[PDB]
Scaffold this active site. Structure first.
Site, short mmCIF file in Angstrom:
data_model
loop_
_atom_site.label_atom_id
_atom_site.label_comp_id
_atom_site.label_asym_id
_atom_site.label_seq_id
_atom_site.Cartn_x
_atom_site.Cartn_y
_atom_site.Cartn_z
N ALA A 34 13.04 12.83 11.01
CA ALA A 34 13.63 11.58 11.56
C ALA A 34 15.01 11.87 12.15
O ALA A 34 15.70 12.78 11.73
CB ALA A 34 13.76 10.54 10.45
N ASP A 35 15.42 11.12 13.13
CA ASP A 35 16.76 11.36 13.75
C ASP A 35 17.83 10.66 12.91
O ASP A 35 17.69 9.51 12.54
CB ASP A 35 16.78 10.80 15.17
CG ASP A 35 16.55 11.93 16.17
OD1 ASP A 35 15.85 12.87 15.82
OD2 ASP A 35 17.08 11.85 17.26
N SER A 36 18.90 11.34 12.60
CA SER A 36 19.98 10.72 11.78
C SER A 36 20.35 9.35 12.36
O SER A 36 20.75 8.45 11.65
CB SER A 36 21.22 11.62 11.79
OG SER A 36 21.77 11.68 10.48
#
Length: 76
Positions: A34-36
């Site tokens: 997942a993207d931060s």
């Protein structure tokens, strides 16, 4: 009850991708990829669902996105 399911709809529908990537024990970045941004970004829309003060430092410093869910129950 409504919190978890609520956040679950937000997390899953967002970082869940295909409804599964969502994971509390996951760091929301290396576990379900997942993207931060989307990660803490989803926890921000979450703070608006139950009206909370979760800042970008919360979802990031929080033990885990799930703790964010536990963060809402602590206010209820």
């Amino acid at each position: 009850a409504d919190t978890l399911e609520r956040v679950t709809k937000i997390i899953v529908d967002r970082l869940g991708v295909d409804e599964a990537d969502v994971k509390l024990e996951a760091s929301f970045k290396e576990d379900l990829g997942a993207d931060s941004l989307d990660v803490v970004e989803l926890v921000m829309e979450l703070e608006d669902e139950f009206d909370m003060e979760i800042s970008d430092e919360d979802a990031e410093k929080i033990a885990t996105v799930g703790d964010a869910v536990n963060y809402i129950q602590n206010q209820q």
